[PDB]
């Protein structure tokens, strides 16, 4: 179960920005952070993990400095590289239990990442990224501080998280299914609805006829999922919650 620290920064123009962030421990989000929040919010009653309260404020301080620095830094890179607003940078940090990773992307395209002891640009990255790397790699303290978090802190943290709040992580929920009629493409449209399951992994097919179109896995407000399987002309469902019990629904 990887811990993904995400971040979306939007820069409308030179003088309008917002940077919001979140954290996914596996398929379940564990933290939240908005541009208009001076702190980081705790969603689940165990988002502090096993880290002390005299150390959780250290992470709080670090990200505060990072946020205001990152915003000014991109604003300045925009001047240097003549980049034209708007700009959209995402940042996908994180690790697992222990290789880590730190990928940043510009306008939805990978431009660089933190491999090794510094910043290394991506394969199909534009030429002007070399300019960014050349300057990012001047800051010595920042380069080691990422290491201090990626190679040591983050792996020790996810350990603390996965312990404090594991009941909610191995939590099983049995779903429910129903069949419906979809808009006729003399062809008809059989639709096998599935909703409420947990965790995300699932297998639903129209058994198996080589024409089943199992749709995407859509989320529900209660941290569960929803699946819509269709067929153009029974329906079988296997899940971890319902052990061995394959939810076969007969038509009609």
């Amino acid at each position, epitope marked *: 179960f990887p811990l993904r620290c995400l971040q979306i920064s939007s820069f409308a123009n030179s003088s309008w920005t917002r940077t919001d962030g979140l954290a996914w421990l596996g398929e379940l989000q564990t933290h939240s952070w908005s541009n208009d929040s001076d702190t980081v919010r705790s969603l689940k009653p165990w988002s502090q993990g096993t880290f002390s309260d005299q150390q959780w404020e250290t992470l709080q301080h670090i990200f505060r*400095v990072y946020r205001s*620095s990152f915003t000014r*830094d991109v604003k*300045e*890179f925009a*001047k*240097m590289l003549r980049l034209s607003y708007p700009l959209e940078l995402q940042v996908s940090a994180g690790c697992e239990v222990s290789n880590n990773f730190f990928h940043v992307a510009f306008q939805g395209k990978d431009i660089l990442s933190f491999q090794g002891t510094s910043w290394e640009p991506t394969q199909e990255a534009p030429l002007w990224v070399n300019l960014a790397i050349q*300057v*990012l790699n*001047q*800051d*010595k*303290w*920042t380069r080691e501080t990422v290491q201090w978090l990626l190679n040591g802190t983050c792996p020790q943290f996810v350990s603390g998280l996965l312990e404090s709040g594991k009941s909610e992580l191995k939590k099983q929920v049995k779903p429910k299914a129903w069949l419906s009629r979809g808009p006729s493409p003399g062809r008809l449209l059989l639709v096998c609805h599935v909703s409420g399951f947990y965790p995300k992994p699932v297998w639903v097919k129209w058994m198996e006829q080589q024409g089943t179109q199992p749709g995407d896995i859509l989320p529900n407000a209660d941290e569960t999922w929803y699946l819509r399987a269709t067929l153009d002309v029974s329906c079988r469902v296997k899940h971890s919650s319902l052990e061995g019990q394959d939810i076969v629904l007969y038509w009609h």
Partner: T-cell receptor
Amino acid sequence: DIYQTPRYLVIGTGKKITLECSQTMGHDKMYWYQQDPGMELHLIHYSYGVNSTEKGDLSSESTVSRIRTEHFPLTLESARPSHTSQYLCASSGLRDRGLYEQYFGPGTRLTVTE
Amino acid sequence: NQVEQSPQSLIILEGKNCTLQCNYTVSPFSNLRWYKQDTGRGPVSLTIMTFSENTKSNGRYTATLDADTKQSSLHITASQLSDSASYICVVSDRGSTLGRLYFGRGTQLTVWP
């Protein structure tokens, strides 16, 4: 390794003044300051490298042109009795330690007359 | 003005040592320099320190760095006539060349016989 010529420069008004600032070491970061005798240092121009030229603190009529890494000339479109000051050039770059320090140019005193 | 710097000007006799101050409210803090500017010449970097340090020496010059109370002072030892100059204290806010530089107005030092 940052030079400035000339050290002194008297010119008439209305004309165009052009201040030479050069460097040997391959630093991409250079600055332009203005200082009045007794006062402090105000940023008027800086540069992250070639073709990059930015306006600093004070909005001066001065303009700069970074076309070569080693050069950073400053230009006044039209002199005036208030544009009489001293102009210092600077440059950031990796020094003896692992930090990026600033070396200052010798300086150029300017006097505009009528 | 984020970098204050006291005293404004002062006049001391030769042979004595004085202590010039420099209080900054710049954050985040990476490094801090001290420059010596003769009347008519350009700034010549005396020292440069980061928050982990708190004492560097350039022979007769010894700046300290109180990184916790955000101040730093230059201690001119055995001040001779040649030390009459301006003393400028500038703080950078990054560890690269992507930062801003914050210059204090400086301290004017006069040394008499």
